[PDB]
PDB file of C-alpha atoms and ligand atoms in Angstrom:
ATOM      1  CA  UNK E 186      23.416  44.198 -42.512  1.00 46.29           C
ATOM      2  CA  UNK E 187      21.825  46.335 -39.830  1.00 44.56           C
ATOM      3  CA  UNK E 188      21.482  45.064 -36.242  1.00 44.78           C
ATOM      4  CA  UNK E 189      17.925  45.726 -34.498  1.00 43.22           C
ATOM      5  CA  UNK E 190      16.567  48.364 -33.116  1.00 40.68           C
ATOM      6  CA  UNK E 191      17.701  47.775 -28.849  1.00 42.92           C
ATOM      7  CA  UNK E 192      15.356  46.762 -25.963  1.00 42.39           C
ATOM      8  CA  UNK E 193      13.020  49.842 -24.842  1.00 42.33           C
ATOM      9  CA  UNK E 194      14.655  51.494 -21.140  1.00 38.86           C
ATOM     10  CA  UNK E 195      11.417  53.137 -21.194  1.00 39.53           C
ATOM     11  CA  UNK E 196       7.795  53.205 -21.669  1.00 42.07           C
ATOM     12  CA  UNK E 197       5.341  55.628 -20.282  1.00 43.09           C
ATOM     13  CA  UNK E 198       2.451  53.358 -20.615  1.00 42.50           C
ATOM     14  CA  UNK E 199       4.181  50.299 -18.782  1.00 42.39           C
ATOM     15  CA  UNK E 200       2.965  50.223 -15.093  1.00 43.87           C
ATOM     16  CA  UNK E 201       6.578  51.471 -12.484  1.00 45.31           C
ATOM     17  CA  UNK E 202       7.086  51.508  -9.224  1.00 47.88           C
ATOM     18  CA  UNK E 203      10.682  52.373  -7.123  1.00 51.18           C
ATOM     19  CA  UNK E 204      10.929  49.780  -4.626  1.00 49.93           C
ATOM     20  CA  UNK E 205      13.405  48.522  -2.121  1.00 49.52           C
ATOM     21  CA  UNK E 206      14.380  45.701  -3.724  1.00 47.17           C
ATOM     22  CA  UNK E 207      14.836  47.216  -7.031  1.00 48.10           C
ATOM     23  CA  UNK E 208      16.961  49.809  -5.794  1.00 45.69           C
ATOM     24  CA  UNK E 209      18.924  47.242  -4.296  1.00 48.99           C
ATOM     25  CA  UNK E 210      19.078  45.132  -8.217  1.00 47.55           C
ATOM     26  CA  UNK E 211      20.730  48.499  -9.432  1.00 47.74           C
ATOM     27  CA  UNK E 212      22.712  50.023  -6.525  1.00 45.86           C
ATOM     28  CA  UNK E 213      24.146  46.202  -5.394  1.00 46.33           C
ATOM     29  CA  UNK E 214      23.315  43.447  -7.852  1.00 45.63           C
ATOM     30  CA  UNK E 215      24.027  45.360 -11.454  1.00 43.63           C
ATOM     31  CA  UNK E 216      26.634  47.346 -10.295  1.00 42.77           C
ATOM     32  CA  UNK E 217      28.888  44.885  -8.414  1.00 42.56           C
ATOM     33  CA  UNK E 218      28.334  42.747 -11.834  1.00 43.41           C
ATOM     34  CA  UNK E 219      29.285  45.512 -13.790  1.00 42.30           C
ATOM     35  CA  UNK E 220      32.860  45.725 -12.377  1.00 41.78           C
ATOM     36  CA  UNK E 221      33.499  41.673 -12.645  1.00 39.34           C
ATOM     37  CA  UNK E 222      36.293  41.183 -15.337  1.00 39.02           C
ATOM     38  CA  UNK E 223      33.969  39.513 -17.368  1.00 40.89           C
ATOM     39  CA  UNK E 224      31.048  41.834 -17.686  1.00 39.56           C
ATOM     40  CA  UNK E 225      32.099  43.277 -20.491  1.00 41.96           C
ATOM     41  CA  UNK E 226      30.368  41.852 -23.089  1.00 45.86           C
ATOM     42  CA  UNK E 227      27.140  41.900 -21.412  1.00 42.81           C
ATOM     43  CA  UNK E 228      27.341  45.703 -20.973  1.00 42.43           C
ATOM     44  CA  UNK E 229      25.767  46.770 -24.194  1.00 40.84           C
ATOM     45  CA  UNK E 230      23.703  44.868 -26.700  1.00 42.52           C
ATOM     46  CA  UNK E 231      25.409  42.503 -29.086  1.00 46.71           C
ATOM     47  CA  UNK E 232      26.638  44.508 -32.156  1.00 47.40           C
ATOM     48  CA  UNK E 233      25.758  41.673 -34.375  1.00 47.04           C
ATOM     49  CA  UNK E 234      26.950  43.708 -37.419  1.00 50.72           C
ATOM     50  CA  UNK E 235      30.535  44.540 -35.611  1.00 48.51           C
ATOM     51  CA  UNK E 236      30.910  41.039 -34.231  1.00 47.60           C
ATOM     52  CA  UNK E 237      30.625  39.613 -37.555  1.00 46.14           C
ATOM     53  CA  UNK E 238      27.604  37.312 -36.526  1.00 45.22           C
ATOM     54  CA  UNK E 239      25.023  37.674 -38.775  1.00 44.39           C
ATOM     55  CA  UNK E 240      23.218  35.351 -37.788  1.00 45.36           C
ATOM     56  CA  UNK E 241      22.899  36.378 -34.077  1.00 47.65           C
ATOM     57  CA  UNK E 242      19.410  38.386 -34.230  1.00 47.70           C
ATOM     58  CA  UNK E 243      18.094  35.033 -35.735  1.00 45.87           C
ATOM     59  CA  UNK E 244      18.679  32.841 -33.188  1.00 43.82           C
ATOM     60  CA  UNK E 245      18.153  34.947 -30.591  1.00 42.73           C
ATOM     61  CA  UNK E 246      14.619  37.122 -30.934  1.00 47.00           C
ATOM     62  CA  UNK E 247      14.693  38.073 -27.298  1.00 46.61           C
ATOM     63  CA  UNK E 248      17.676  39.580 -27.154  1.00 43.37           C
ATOM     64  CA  UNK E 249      18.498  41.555 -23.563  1.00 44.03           C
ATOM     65  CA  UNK E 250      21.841  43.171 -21.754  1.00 45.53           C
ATOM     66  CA  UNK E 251      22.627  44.791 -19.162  1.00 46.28           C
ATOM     67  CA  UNK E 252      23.133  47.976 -20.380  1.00 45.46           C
ATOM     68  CA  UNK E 253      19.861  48.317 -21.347  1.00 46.14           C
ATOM     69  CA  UNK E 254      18.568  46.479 -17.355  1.00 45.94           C
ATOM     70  CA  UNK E 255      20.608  49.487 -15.959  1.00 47.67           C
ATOM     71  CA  UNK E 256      18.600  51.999 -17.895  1.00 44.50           C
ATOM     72  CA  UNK E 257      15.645  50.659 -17.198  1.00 43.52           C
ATOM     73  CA  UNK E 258      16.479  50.493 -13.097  1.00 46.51           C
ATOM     74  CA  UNK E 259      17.652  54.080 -13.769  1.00 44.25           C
ATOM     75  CA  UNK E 260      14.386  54.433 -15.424  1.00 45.33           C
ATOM     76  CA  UNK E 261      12.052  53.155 -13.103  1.00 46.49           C
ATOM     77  CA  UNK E 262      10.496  51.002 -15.496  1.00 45.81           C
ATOM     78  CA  UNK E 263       9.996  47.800 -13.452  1.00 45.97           C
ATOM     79  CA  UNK E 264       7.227  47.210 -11.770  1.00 48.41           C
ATOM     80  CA  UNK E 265       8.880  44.830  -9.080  1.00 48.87           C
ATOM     81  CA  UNK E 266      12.027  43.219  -8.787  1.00 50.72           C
ATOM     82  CA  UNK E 267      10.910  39.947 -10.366  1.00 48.65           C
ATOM     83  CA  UNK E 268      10.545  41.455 -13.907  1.00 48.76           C
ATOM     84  CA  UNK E 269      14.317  42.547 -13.509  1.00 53.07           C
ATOM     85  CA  UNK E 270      15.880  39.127 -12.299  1.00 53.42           C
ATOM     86  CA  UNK E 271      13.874  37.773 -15.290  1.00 56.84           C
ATOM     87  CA  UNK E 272      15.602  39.859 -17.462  1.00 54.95           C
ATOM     88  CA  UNK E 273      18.987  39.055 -16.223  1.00 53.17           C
ATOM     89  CA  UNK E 274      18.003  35.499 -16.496  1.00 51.23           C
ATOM     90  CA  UNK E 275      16.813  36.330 -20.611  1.00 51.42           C
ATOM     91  CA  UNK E 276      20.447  37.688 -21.018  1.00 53.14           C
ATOM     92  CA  UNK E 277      22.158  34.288 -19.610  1.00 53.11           C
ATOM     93  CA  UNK E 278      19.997  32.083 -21.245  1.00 50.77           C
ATOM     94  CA  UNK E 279      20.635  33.988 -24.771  1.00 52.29           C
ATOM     95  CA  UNK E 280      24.320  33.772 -24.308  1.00 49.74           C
ATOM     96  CA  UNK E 281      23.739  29.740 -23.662  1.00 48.28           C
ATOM     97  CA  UNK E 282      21.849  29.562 -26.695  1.00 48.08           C
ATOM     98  CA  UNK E 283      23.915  31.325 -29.324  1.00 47.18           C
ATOM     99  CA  UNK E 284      27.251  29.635 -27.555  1.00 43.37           C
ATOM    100  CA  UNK E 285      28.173  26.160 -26.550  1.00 44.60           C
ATOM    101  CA  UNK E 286      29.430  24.526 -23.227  1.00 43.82           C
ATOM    102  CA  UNK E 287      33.384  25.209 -22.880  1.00 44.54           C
ATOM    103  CA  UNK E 288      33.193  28.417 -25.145  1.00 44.16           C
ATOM    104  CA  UNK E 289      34.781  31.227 -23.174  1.00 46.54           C
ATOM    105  CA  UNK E 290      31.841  33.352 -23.028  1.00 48.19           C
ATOM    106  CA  UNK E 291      30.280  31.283 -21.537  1.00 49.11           C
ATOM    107  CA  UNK E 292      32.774  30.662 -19.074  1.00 51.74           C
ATOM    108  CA  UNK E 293      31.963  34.363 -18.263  1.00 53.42           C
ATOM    109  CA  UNK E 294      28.357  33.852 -18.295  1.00 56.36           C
ATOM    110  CA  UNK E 295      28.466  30.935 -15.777  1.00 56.55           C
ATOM    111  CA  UNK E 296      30.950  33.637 -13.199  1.00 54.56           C
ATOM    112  CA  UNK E 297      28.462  36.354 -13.622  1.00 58.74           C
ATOM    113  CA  UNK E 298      25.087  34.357 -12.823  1.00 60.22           C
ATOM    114  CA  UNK E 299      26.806  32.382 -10.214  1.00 61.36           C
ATOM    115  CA  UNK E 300      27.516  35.882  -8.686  1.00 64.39           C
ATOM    116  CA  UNK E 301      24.055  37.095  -9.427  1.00 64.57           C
ATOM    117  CA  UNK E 302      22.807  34.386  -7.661  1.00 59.23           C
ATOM    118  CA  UNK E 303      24.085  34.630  -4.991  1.00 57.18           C
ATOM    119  CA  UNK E 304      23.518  38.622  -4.953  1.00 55.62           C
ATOM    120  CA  UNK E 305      19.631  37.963  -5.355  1.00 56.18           C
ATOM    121  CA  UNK E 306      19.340  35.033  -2.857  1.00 56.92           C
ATOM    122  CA  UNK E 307      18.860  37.365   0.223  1.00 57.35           C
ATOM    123  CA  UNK E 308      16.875  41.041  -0.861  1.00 57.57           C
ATOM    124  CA  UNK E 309      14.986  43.835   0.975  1.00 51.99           C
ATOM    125  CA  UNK E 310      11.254  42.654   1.957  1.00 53.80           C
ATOM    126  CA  UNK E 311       9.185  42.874  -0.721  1.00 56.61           C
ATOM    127  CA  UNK E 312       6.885  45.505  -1.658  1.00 56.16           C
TER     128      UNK E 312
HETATM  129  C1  62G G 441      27.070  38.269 -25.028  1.00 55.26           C
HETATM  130  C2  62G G 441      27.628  37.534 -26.180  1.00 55.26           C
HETATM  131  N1  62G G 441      27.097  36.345 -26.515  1.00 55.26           N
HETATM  132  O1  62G G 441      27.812  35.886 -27.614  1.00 55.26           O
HETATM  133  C3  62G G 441      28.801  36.769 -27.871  1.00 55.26           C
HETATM  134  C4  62G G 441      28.736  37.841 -27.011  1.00 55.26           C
HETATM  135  C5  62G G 441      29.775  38.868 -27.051  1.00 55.26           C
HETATM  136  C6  62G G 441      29.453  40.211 -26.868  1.00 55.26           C
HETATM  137  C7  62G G 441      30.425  41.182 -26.994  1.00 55.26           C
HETATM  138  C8  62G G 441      31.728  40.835 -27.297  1.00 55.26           C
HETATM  139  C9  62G G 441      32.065  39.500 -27.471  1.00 55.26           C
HETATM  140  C10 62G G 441      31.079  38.538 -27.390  1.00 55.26           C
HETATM  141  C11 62G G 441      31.538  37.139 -27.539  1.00 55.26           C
HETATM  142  C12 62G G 441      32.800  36.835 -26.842  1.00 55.26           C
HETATM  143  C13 62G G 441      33.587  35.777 -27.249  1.00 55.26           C
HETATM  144  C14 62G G 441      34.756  35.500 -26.554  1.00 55.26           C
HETATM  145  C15 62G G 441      35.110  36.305 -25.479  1.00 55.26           C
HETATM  146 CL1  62G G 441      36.559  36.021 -24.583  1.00 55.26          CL
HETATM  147  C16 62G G 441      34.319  37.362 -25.095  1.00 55.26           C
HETATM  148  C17 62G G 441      33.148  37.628 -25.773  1.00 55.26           C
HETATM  149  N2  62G G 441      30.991  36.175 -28.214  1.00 55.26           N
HETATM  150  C18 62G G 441      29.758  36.468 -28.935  1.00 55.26           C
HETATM  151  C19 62G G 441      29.338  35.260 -29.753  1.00 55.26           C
HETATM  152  C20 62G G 441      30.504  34.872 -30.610  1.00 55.26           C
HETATM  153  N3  62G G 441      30.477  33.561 -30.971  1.00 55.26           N
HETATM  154  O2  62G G 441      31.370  35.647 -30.980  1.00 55.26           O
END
């Protein structure tokens, strides 16, 4: 049992730009959610094989974290802030897949994109 190979953090072929509001997503939005108590297990991807759920990676066939939307703000490899709140928004809705209402991950996932939310609601002008 293998998991799969993890999200690219870069690729040179994928248009990039550094703008203000991405610099705020990393230096603001992912790293105030990074230090919530509950980030944890949204900090790397899901060791399927560790966790003992084998049947995570077929579920879930777009699987993202925020390890990996850190790299890739580290990176540069976002175009504009959009394509990172959309990842952020893949992560929460795999976690609501995989679990159920009431489980307590996703108690944490509800804290953390309540927080984002709120993070994202007021940015830098656009660019
Ligand atoms: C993301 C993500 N989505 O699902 C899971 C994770 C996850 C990632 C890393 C460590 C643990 C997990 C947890 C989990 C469960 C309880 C608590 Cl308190 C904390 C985390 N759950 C699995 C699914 C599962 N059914 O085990």
């Amino acid at each position: 049992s293998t998991n799969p190979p993890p999200p690219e953090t870069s690729n040179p072929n994928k248009p990039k730009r550094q703008t203000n509001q991405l610099q705020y997503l990393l230096r603001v939005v992912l790293k105030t959610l990074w230090k919530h108590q509950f980030a944890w297990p949204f900090q790397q991807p899901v060791d399927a094989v560790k966790l003992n759920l084998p049947d995570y990676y077929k579920i879930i066939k777009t699987p993202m974290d925020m390890g990996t939307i850190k790299k890739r703000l580290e990176n540069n490899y976002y175009w504009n802030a959009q394509e990172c709140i959309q990842d952020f928004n893949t992560m929460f809705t795999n976690c609501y897949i995989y679990n159920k209402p009431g489980d307590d991950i996703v108690l944490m996932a509800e804290a953390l994109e309540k927080l984002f939310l709120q993070k994202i609601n007021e940015l830098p002008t656009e660019e």
